[PDB]
Amino acid sequence: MVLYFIGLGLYDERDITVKGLEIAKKCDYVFAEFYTSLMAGTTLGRIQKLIGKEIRVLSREDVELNFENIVLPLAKENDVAFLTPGDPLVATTHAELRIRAKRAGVESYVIHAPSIYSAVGITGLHIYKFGKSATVAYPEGNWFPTSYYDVIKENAERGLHTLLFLDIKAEKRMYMTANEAMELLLKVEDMKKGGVFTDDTLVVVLARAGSMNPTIRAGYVKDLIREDFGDPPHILIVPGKLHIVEAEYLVEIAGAPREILRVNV
Amino acid sequence: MVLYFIGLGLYDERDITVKGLEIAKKCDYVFAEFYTSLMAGTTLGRIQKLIGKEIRVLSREDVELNFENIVLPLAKENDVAFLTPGDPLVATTHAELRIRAKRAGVESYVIHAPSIYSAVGITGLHIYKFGKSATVAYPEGNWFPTSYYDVIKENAERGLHTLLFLDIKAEKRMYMTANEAMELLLKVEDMKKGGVFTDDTLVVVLARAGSMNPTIRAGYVKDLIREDFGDPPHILIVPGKLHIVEAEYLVEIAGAPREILRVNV
Ligand SMILES: Nc1ncnc2c1ncn2[C@@H]1O[C@H](CSCC[C@H](N)C(=O)O)[C@@H](O)[C@H]1O
Ligand code: NA
């Protein structure tokens, strides 16, 4: 009679909380999805071994179209868990799944876990200063989307930071690197020419947040565009004007050039 | 000879990640602060019991003025952990403490935990639609803070949601309720009269996120300003322009007036 939305956290199988683990262990059925994101620091096998339960993976369609025919029926006479990378309900369409549960007479509870939305605090950038967030999508065919560029513009204009999620093809396991995101943004700049993203723009790259050894690099596009940040997933941030304390952290921790202490403050 | 920043999570001791628990267990010394937030469902004893160590609790002054004199010296010869509610680097100034660590030749690692910043996802409001954040601070003497009012205005003009962290005076055991935040906001409106926060403004209250039954309520200020949302901590959110599914969730899950379903696109 109960459905548990449980977050898996950032990087590996140990990123789930103690509460999430113990609750999952007591569930009769455990489902998971890896289409909104993947756990690059672990495998399904390692997660299953840790939880001690067989885990049935669900595709995007399984969830978006048939959540009520696959997960909810079991939740009527059993304790069921639905695992997702990060913190539950962060992915835009997941909150609606709770309405589906209610509609079916099923109780649902949320067990939180670390999300990149909060984990980016490791970049030293004040989290109250982040503005609207966006996702950089690959152009294709006659389709060349650029809304994420306008997001950066509206945020930076008000001195706010822009968190940028990079395109991902979970099924094909293809990730968009920060390098690719930068090249794309430079391309969008040439078309819109709004003075939003150029070789002189300061950016921050966060990779493998949650791991014990994340990659945190900050610098100008002209110097980072071809730099190797390691294996995905990569997160890109376009800071607004910096707090001197933010800049100092970026210099001392993320290896940013001293130049930002005078140029971007 | 290392220093761990380890988040404890939202509500109780079980909100710590498995990674944080296992690392915290093997540390030689364990320090912690409980003034940046409130973990309503646990006690120091329960935390110590879970980690199996003696925890030395530090005050804001101990940290902000003497972190390098109390914590760092021990990190040079041992493995030290510094625990904090939620995520250690979110809406705190703890990030700067990593600079101090580095300058003392001490390596530091950050272990994230669920934060209120991402937990807002449980309100049904799209996480990427949040704009600049702010803190409703208690007036002191003749000093009446009001900047947070302007943040709401700026975000609202952009159709973005506003997350409002609520004040806390831990040494006086004072935790601002959403009710007090609303009262203070109406007073600021009377002063500025920008039509930003009135009896008719739709707001959302999230109380004790991290618990199994958090209080999630949405509605007009006039109706919620005196409602009892239970014990602290609370956060207040003034949504911007709503998507239909967001309104649907607020109505079905947060008990908002059915009339907000009719969004004025
Ligand atoms: N579980 C919870 N429920 C509701 N509000 C919470 C909360 N935890 C923190 N807050 C809010 O945030 C304020 C502390 S700000 C510090 C936040 C912390 N580092 C984190 O990552 O969550 C509180 O005064 C309160 O307004
Ligand atoms: Na945000």
Curated annotation (Swiss-Prot), chains A, B:
GO terms for biological process: methylation; protein histidyl modification to diphthamide. Keywords: Methyltransferase, S-adenosyl-L-methionine, Transferase. Pfam families: TP_methylase. Signal peptide: none annotated. One of its GO terms (molecular function) is diphthine synthase activity. It is an enzyme of class 2 (transferase). SUPFAM superfamilies: Tetrapyrrole methylase. Pathway: Protein modification; peptidyl-diphthamide biosynthesis. S-adenosyl-L-methionine binds at L10, D87, V90, S115, I116, L166, A209, H234. It catalyses: 2-[(3S)-amino-3-carboxypropyl]-L-histidyl-[translation elongation factor 2] + 3 S-adenosyl-L-methionine = diphthine-[translation elongation factor 2] + 3 S-adenosyl-L-homocysteine + 3 H(+). Its EC number is 2.1.1.98. Belongs to the diphthine synthase family. Homodimer. S-adenosyl-L-methionine-dependent methyltransferase that catalyzes the trimethylation of the amino group of the modified target histidine residue in translation elongation factor 2 (EF-2), to form an intermediate called diphthine. The three successive methylation reactions represent the second step of diphthamide biosynthesis. The diphthine intermediate is not stable in vitro and readily eliminates the trimethylamino group. It is not known whether the elimination reaction also occurs physiologically. This is Diphthine synthase.
